């Protein structure tokens, strides 16, 4: 029901499974021998992975919403590092 | 010039 | 069995591109002078490029240029409404 | 005399020649140097080196702080938009994205961004990028409506007076009323806490919003309310704006005595503070030429529009909406002035240039195309009549048939069916159908044109009387309804005499119609009389157009502020 | 709706609750994952204790500050909240180097 | 209904908005993220920031390696060349400098620089900057020339076949002839040391060189050699290119039963592999619409040029050679299709557009203006005779006279004096003078075109007969030289039925003239015979009309390559 | 319409 997400800094980021299935790579983490499930994100630091998890609650809540969806804020100092994590996670 | 200018 | 059926022209563009009114409304020619004595025969015409316009609008367009307004192809009617 | 270059200018050229290596260090220069390095890149034609830095909000915010050299920034920016880089769209989007990132931040930064957004959004509004200045101001307005501090409502209206200006020029009138209603929300709440904010610029925008929709009775209501709030301590830009819009609303109310003292003061007031080569001064001239064209002072009206265009052709580069509005206004005046001559080559060139700019920068379904297409179509239908080729005559009329009905739909969709602009497009279709040998359709357009012009405007008006003469000319010259043209010719002349006297230039087309009226039915005694009246009009017409150009009519220091307003208010 | 996160040392639970939802069932949500007694657990927003009786919206966790993209954080104590990391500070560029 | 934005696309917008502080750390991003950032610079309108980031080969090479999104790269690249940023010229110069430095360096490093050059030179050849891809390919030729062993001989011939392509399309035929001889040396050199390569790519590439120089007899000879070398291991792009040029040369040899077999498979093979929105598949359609234009199937040829243009109008932007050659082909076909109807408005628009593109991207003395300015002149000389205005009658004929003289000068400079293409423009001059009423030179130009075309093409061809009908109409309608005009009419009428059939569209313009020659002398008995078959010609037109789009004529999997490559050769 | 199409 929940997915235990750890970062490169060892931070714990347990999030609901339906939120973490938005990204394709985490779906591969939960599939196979990986199946709270421990997942390793040794290359993704915690300051950029926190924004990834904030997107999951932002993505799932705002699916097929009738109202104007606010843009996800991604700060300039994190945007480049978050972009690499967005590609790797297929988020 | 059989008419006036355009409004 | 009483039934209700909305009829409409099966174009998906649903806007004339000459008069720029709705494809189901009257053309700008028939919506300016007489909208009751001329509205009955203000039909729409398609083309080989499958871009339907108001027949009044497309004829008024062909009186100057011989191409479809949207894509510059040779204009030839394929069907009308009547 | 071979004066050596300054070491400053010589060092500009040395740094620009080594721009690529030192492009990072130029961004840390003082603003006066930094603008001059960037202006030299434009002068050298290196728009890609220059445009790759103007796309950054921080760099452009630094070159916006050089207030004296804004006449060069408005000319580099326009050259950048023509060059193919969307710096206005990027800077509006780069600001809005950055503005939304400090919503949860402190109010110290949140007030610096509004300062940046007013010099940026006010620049884009000045440059003519209303669709992009609106995106900046909507972000500035969003900053004012998060923390409910005393100063914030003072700035939320200051956004909503500029957010309303960028929607009047963009023809978002249906959002314009929503903005003014939103403006009073913070205006009333500010007035509750012992602070009556000056409602002078805000009320002046409705003098242009409601005039644009031709709510002349409603526009004049807010024309008075705007000038009651003019104070000598106000900025000249705010004061000049109200006087222009008040003049525009006064002329369309068929009152000219109060209108001349406002705009002529405004032309001088803009020429004093700003200068003779300022965008704001050219804005007055177009509104000043609006007076001269309407009051039949047509000979000097072309020069005022040409003077306005020459200012905008220098400050605002090649393809700008401010150059285009000057073109479509000068083309109409050149159409009116050269209507008697019949030669339309300068007028058609300006009318074609105006549509060539508007179609390039604005969408093809935009309201400013209604005025530009109308002006060219009036010129097109009059070129074909004056030429002798039948094939050209049958083509230019149909070419002008496309424009009027395309223009009519733009007015009908936005302004609605019952409005002056929609009726004014019917009158042009009345001229159009008469010249296309479709005589029966020309009558039903004129009747529809009058019945709308007569209704909202009133019985006696400039607009309704000008179209009666066309209907009178239709009943007279070609469809042989001589019994109906007699009362219409007199009705047009009676209104023309009331507001213009014997100096009205359209009486020639009315007196000549009256001569043709009786030569086919009888009563030849009035033919000699009306020919004498036409003769009396002829030499009286050659008495007033020889007055000097209207540019020096305002002279220097004719009157003073806080006195022209009072003179207007009492009368 | 209210979206928020809870942190004790390095944990972060991205759970949600209604604007009228109370701390009582929110604390029981923590027991679903942390499998620890709820009475021992105490929560800490901006160095302030929260009673279980009052709702989440009564303590200041309104929807305006609990957006899914920028959730409001609240500490957890059985405070040793570990910061995530320092992002690489970009040069000011406009500042002279 | 308002789906949320992807985190990737949201981070792309945030990185692009943060360009100034991160314009150099983007170059350290992965391969697939660099393109998406640089695409967002195009989408946002930041062409000035993107132009400075595609003029550098160090970062543009990583962009080129994104093969999935190459259709977006062609439209960004064309956006900058339209923008004013000479990206192709700088990348040619940025690679010309690079090759010289690596030339002294290790040969293994030279292998990497050659592979980059094929990707960059191949792109600039695909994008249509042939003059700027020749410089890249010449630089790649220098690296392979320096070393002489088995490893670099495969690349040296690969440079030469690619260098031949960027010169055939650039109308540098005087250099394309010698570069095959240079390529001929490396084929023999590779064959000497016990190694055999594929000659299909090279033999079939010069088939366009000979076709463009109107050496149709020699072009067909090399097509047979090209078809011999087709094997199963060749890439589809190579097989499509050799099937395209084989079809083009089979048409001008007046055997259309075999050109259709080669171009229908080429259309299917290009569509099956490259898809329906690929610039290579668009290249096939222009050669497929070249076949249908020359077999009197004009009604099915406009729909193919319009389909080939729409691919090149979307894959490539405006002001490009590939969207210009698609206009000038469609402007000619719409001129031919609307020749009887007289609706020369779409055809003139597609002719003026191709004029405004070539004069912007090519020099005034380029040979591709010969075909572009000709097609505009043919449309102009028919608009004026269609309208009923006097002042425009002299202006349009005079303006069309300038283009044909200009088209003749460029053709004569490159093809010499006795050439089919130069003689083709002579026939256009003859029709020009007939409308402009300078009959003294009209007979000279028409008989000069006939003399050269019959001398080289032959006495039995489609091209030679069309010029005869132009001269035959000159004698009949105005010159009144009926004693030899009737011989000319029967010559063109008989050959038209032999080549195409009784339903050939050009027979109507010959029937009307030949009847008018008979009514002018009073012979009314033979007139009734033609009016008995002129109605039959109209009757035959009703059955042969049958407008079905030729895009689905090729269907799905008619044959395979092995059957098509042998059916052209077994029948040969 | 007198002659044929251009080559
Ligand atoms: Zn319509
Ligand atoms: Zn209609
Ligand atoms: Zn169409
Ligand atoms: Zn640029």
Curated annotation (Swiss-Prot), chain A:
Q: Name one GO biological process term.
A: target-directed miRNA degradation
In what way is this protein post-translationally modified? Ubiquitinated by the DCX(AMBRA1) complex, leading to its degradation by the proteasome.
Q: Where is the protein found, in the record's own terms?
A: Nucleus
The molecular function GO annotations come to: protein-macromolecule adaptor activity; transcription corepressor binding
The UniProt entry's GO CC annotations, sorted and at most eight, read: Cul2-RING ubiquitin ligase complex; Cul5-RING ubiquitin ligase complex; cytosol; elongin complex; nucleoplasm
Q: Name one Pfam family in it.
A: Skp1_POZ
**Classification via InterPro entries:** ELC1, SKP1-like, SKP1/BTB/POZ_sf, Skp1_comp_POZ
The highest taxon in the source lineage is Eukaryota
Please tell me where this protein is predominantly located: nucleus
Q: Which CDD domains match?
A: BTB_POZ_EloC
Relate the protein's function as given in its record: SIII, also known as elongin, is a general transcription elongation factor that increases the RNA polymerase II transcription elongation past template-encoded arresting sites. Subunit A is transcriptionally active and its transcription activity is strongly enhanced by binding to the dimeric complex of the SIII regulatory subunits B and C (elongin BC complex). Core component of multiple cullin-RING-based ECS (ElonginB/C-CUL2/5-SOCS-box protein) E3 ubiquitin-protein ligase complexes, which mediate the ubiquitination of target proteins. By binding to BC-box motifs it seems to link target recruitment subunits, like VHL and members of the SOCS box family, to Cullin/RBX1 modules that activate E2 ubiquitination enzymes. Component the von Hippel-Lindau ubiquitination complex CBC(VHL).
Q: Which family does it belong to?
A: Belongs to the SKP1 family.
According to UniProt, the name of this protein is Elongin-C
Q: Which organism is it from?
A: Homo sapiens
Q: Gene encoding it? A: ELOC
Curated annotation (Swiss-Prot), chain C:
First-level EC class: transferase
* Family, per entry: Belongs to the RING-box family.
Q: What EC number(s) does its UniProt record assign?
A: 2.3.2.27, 2.3.2.32
Any one biological process term the GO annotation gives: negative regulation of type I interferon production
Q: Which reaction does it catalyse?
A: S-ubiquitinyl-[E2 ubiquitin-conjugating enzyme]-L-cysteine + [acceptor protein]-L-lysine = [E2 ubiquitin-conjugating enzyme]-L-cysteine + N(6)-ubiquitinyl-[acceptor protein]-L-lysine; S-[NEDD8-protein]-yl-[E2 NEDD8-conjugating enzyme]-L-cysteine + [cullin]-L-lysine = [E2 NEDD8-conjugating enzyme]-L-cysteine + N(6)-[NEDD8-protein]-yl-[cullin]-L-lysine
The residues of the intact protein that this chain contains are 27 to 108 of 108
Subunit structure as annotated in this protein's UniProt entry: Component of multiple Cul1-RING E3 ubiquitin-protein ligase complexes commonly known as SCF (SKP1-CUL1-F-box) complexes, consisting of CUL1, SKP1, RBX1 and a variable F-box domain-containing protein. Part of a SCF(SKP2) complex consisting of CUL1, RBX1, SKP1 and SKP2. Part of a SCF(FBXO3) complex consisting of CUL1, FBXO3, RBX1 and SKP1; this complex interacts with PML via FBXO3. Component of the SCF(Cyclin F) complex consisting of CUL1, RBX1, SKP1 and CCNF. Identified in a SCF E3 ubiquitin ligase complex together with HINT1 and CDC34.
- Phenotype for residue 30 to A: Strong reduction in ligase activity
Q: Provide the protein name.
A: E3 ubiquitin-protein ligase RBX1
Q: From the Swiss-Prot or TrEMBL record, what is one GO molecular function term?
A: molecular adaptor activity
Q: Where does Zn(2+) 1 bind?
A: 16, 19, 54, 57
Q: Where in the cell is it found?
A: Cytoplasm; Nucleus
Please tell me where Zn(2+) 3 binds in this chain: 49, 51, 68, 71
Swiss-Prot record, chain D:
Q: Where in the cell is it found?
A: Nucleus; Cytoplasm, Cytoskeleton; Membrane
Ranges: TPR repeats: 44-77, 114-147, 200-233, 282-315, 327-361, 423-456, 465-499, 508-541
Keywords assigned by UniProt, alphabetized: Cytoplasm, Cytoskeleton, Membrane, Microtubule, Nucleus, Protein transport, Repeat, TPR repeat, Transport, Ubl conjugation pathway
**Superkingdom of the organism of origin:** Eukaryota
Q: Please provide one cellular component term from the Gene Ontology annotations of this protein.
A: cytoplasm
Q: Name one Pfam family in it.
A: TPR_10
Question: How is the protein disposed in the membrane?
Answer: Peripheral membrane protein
Q: Which SUPFAM superfamilies match?
A: TPR-like (SSF48452)
Q: How is it modified after translation?
A: Rapidly degraded by the proteasome upon overexpression of a C-terminal fragment of APP.
Please list the GO terms describing molecular function. microtubule motor activity; ubiquitin-like ligase-substrate adaptor activity
Listed pathway(s): Protein modification; protein ubiquitination
GO BP, sorted A to Z:
intracellular protein transport; intracellular transport; proteasome-mediated ubiquitin-dependent protein catabolic process; protein ubiquitination
Modes of activity regulation: E3 ubiquitin-protein ligase activity of the CRL2(APPBP2) complex is inhibited by APP.
- Note the Gene3D superfamilies from the entry: Tetratricopeptide repeat domain
Could you give the subunit structure recorded for this chain? Component of a CRL2 E3 ubiquitin-protein ligase complex, also named ECS (Elongin BC-CUL2/5-SOCS-box protein) complex, composed of CUL2, Elongin BC (ELOB and ELOC), RBX1 and substrate-specific adapter APPBP2. Interacts with APP; APP interaction inhibits the E3 ubiquitin-protein ligase activity of the CRL2(APPBP2) complex.
Instruction: State what protein this is by name.
Output: Amyloid protein-binding protein 2
- Origin organism is Homo sapiens (Human)
Phylogenetic lineage: Eukaryota, Metazoa, Chordata, Craniata, Vertebrata
From Swiss-Prot, chain E:
Q: In which pathway does it act?
A: Protein modification; protein ubiquitination
Listed under subunit, the entry gives: Heterotrimer of an A (ELOA, ELOA2 or ELOA3P), ELOB and ELOC subunit. The elongin BC complex interacts with EPOP; leading to recruit the elongin BC complex to Polycomb group (PcG) target genes, thereby restricting excessive activity of the PRC2/EED-EZH2 complex. (Microbial infection) Following infection by HIV-1 virus, component of a cullin-5-RING E3 ubiquitin-protein ligase complex (ECS complex) hijacked by the HIV-1 Vif protein.
What are the top taxonomic ranks of the organism? Answer: Eukaryota, Metazoa, Chordata, Craniata, Vertebrata
| Alphabetical list of InterPro entries matching this protein | ELOB, Ubiquitin-like_dom, Ubiquitin-like_domsf
Q: Gene name?
A: ELOB
Tell whether Nucleus is among the UniProt keywords.
Answer: yes
Which Gene3D superfamilies does this UniProt record tie to the protein? Phosphatidylinositol 3-kinase Catalytic Subunit, Chain A, domain 1 (3.10.20.90)
Q: Which UniProt keywords apply?
A: Acetylation, Host-virus interaction, Nucleus, Phosphoprotein, Transcription, Transcription regulation, Ubl conjugation pathway
Q: Which residues form the Ubiquitin-like domain?
A: 1-65
Could you tell me what this protein is called? Elongin-B
As for what it does, the entry says: SIII, also known as elongin, is a general transcription elongation factor that increases the RNA polymerase II transcription elongation past template-encoded arresting sites. Subunit A is transcriptionally active and its transcription activity is strongly enhanced by binding to the dimeric complex of the SIII regulatory subunits B and C (elongin BC complex).
**Compartments reported by the entry:** Nucleus
Q: What protein family is recorded?
A: Belongs to the Elongin B family.
Q: Which SUPFAM superfamilies match?
A: Ubiquitin-like
For whether the record's keyword set contains Ribonucleoprotein, the answer is no
């Amino acid at each position: 029901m929940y997915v235990k997400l750890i970062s490169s800094d060892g931070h714990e980021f347990i999030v609901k499974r339906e939120h973490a299935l938005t990204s394709g790579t985490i779906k591969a983490m939960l599939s196979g021998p990986g199946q709270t499930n421990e997942v390793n994100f040794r290359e993704i630091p915690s300051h950029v992975l926190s924004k990834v998890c904030m997107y999951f609650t932002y993505k799932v809540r705002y699916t097929n919403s009738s109202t104007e969806i606010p843009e996800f804020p991604i700060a300039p100092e994190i945007a480049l590092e978050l972009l690499m994590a967005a590609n790797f996670l297929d988020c | 010039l059989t008419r006036n200018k355009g409004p | 069995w009483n039934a209700v059926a909305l009829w409409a022209w099966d174009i998906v563009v649903d806007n004339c591109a000459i008069c720029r009114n709705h494809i189901m409304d009257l053309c700008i020619e028939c919506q300016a002078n007489q909208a009751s004595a001329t509205s009955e025969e203000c039909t729409v015409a398609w083309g080989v490029c499958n871009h339907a316009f108001h027949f009044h609008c497309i004829s008024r367009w062909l009186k100057t240029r011989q191409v479809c307004p949207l894509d510059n192809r040779e204009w030839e009617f394929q069907k009308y409404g009547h | 005399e071979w004066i050596p270059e300054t070491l400053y200018n010589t060092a500009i050229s040395a740094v620009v020649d080594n721009y690529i290596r030192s492009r990072r260090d130029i961004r840390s220069l003082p603003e006066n140097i930094q603008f001059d390095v960037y202006y030299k890149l434009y002068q050298q034609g290196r728009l890609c080196q220059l445009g790759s830095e103007f796309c950054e909000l921080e760099v452009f915010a630094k070159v916006l702080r050089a207030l004296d050299k804004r006449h060069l920034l408005h000319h580099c920016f326009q050259a950048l938009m023509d060059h193919g880089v969307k710096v206005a769209s990027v800077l509006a989007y780069s600001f809005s994205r950055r503005c939304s990132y400090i919503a949860e931040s402190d109010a110290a930064v949140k007030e610096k961004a509004i300062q940046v957004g007013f010099v940026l959004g006010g620049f884009l509004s000045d440059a003519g990028w209303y669709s992009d200045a609106e995106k900046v101001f909507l972000s500035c307005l969003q900053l004012c409506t998060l923390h409910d501090e005393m100063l914030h409502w003072f700035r939320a209206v200051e956004c909503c007076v500029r957010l309303l200006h960028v929607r009047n020029g963009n023809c978002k009138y249906h959002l314009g009323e929503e903005t003014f209603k939103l403006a009073q929300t913070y205006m009333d709440k500010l007035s509750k806490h012992g602070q009556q904010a000056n409602k002078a610029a805000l009320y002046g925008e409705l003098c242009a919003l409601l005039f644009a929709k031709s709510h002349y009775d409603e526009a004049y209501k807010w024309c008075i309310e705007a000038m009651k709030e003019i104070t000598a301590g106000l900025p000249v830009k705010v004061v000049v704006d109200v006087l222009r819009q008040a003049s525009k609303a006064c002329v369309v109310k068929r009152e000219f005595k109060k209108a001349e003292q406002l705009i002529k003061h405004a032309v001088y007031l803009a020429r004093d503070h700003f200068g003779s080569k300022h965008p704001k001064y050219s804005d007055t001239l177009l509104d000043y030429g609006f007076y001269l064209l309407n009051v039949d002072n047509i000979c000097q009206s072309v020069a005022i529009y040409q003077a306005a265009l020459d200012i905008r052709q220098s400050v605002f580069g090649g393809k700008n909406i401010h150059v285009a509005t000057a073109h479509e206004d000068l083309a109409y005046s050149s159409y009116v002035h050269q209507y008697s001559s019949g030669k339309f080559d300068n007028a058609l060139f300006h009318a074609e240039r105006a549509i060539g700019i508007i179609t390039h920068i604005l969408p093809e379904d935009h309201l400013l195309l209604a005025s530009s297409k109308r002006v060219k179509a009036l010129i097109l239908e009059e070129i074909a009549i004056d030429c002798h080729n039948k094939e050209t005559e049958q083509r230019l009329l149909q070419e002008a048939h496309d424009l009027h009905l395309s223009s009519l739909q733009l007015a009908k969709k936005a302004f609605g069916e019952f409005n002056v602009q929609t009726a004014k497009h019917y009158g042009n279709l009345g001229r159009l159908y008469q010249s296309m040998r479709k005589f029966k359709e020309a009558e039903e357009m004129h009747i529809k044109a009058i019945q709308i012009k007569e209704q909202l405007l009133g019985q006696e008006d400039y607009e309704v009387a000008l179209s009666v003469g066309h209907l009178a000319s239709l009943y007279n010259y070609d469809m042989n309804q001589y019994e109906n043209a007699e009362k219409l010719y007199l009705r047009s002349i009676a209104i023309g005499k009331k507001l213009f006297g014997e100096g009205y230039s359209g009486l020639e087309y009315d007196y000549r119609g009256l001569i043709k009226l009786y030569n086919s039915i009888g009563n030849y005694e009035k033919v000699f009389e009306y020919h004498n009246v036409l003769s009396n009009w002829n030499r009286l017409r050659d008495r007033q157009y020889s007055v000097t150009d209207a540019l020096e009519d305002v002279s220097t220091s004719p009157q003073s502020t806080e006195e022209v307003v009072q003179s207007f208010l009492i009368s | 709706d209210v979206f928020l996160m809870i942190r004790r040392h390095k944990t972060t639970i991205f759970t949600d609750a209604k604007e009228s939802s109370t701390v009582f069932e929110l604390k029981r949500i923590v027991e679903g994952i942390l499998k620890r007694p709820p009475d021992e657990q105490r929560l800490y927003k901006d160095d302030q204790l929260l009673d279980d009786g009052k709702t989440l919206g009564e303590c200041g966790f309104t929807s305006q500050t609990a957006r899914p993209q920028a959730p409001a954080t609240v500490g957890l104590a059985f405070l040793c909240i570990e910061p995530f990391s320092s992002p690489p500070e970009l040069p000011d560029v406009m500042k002279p180097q």
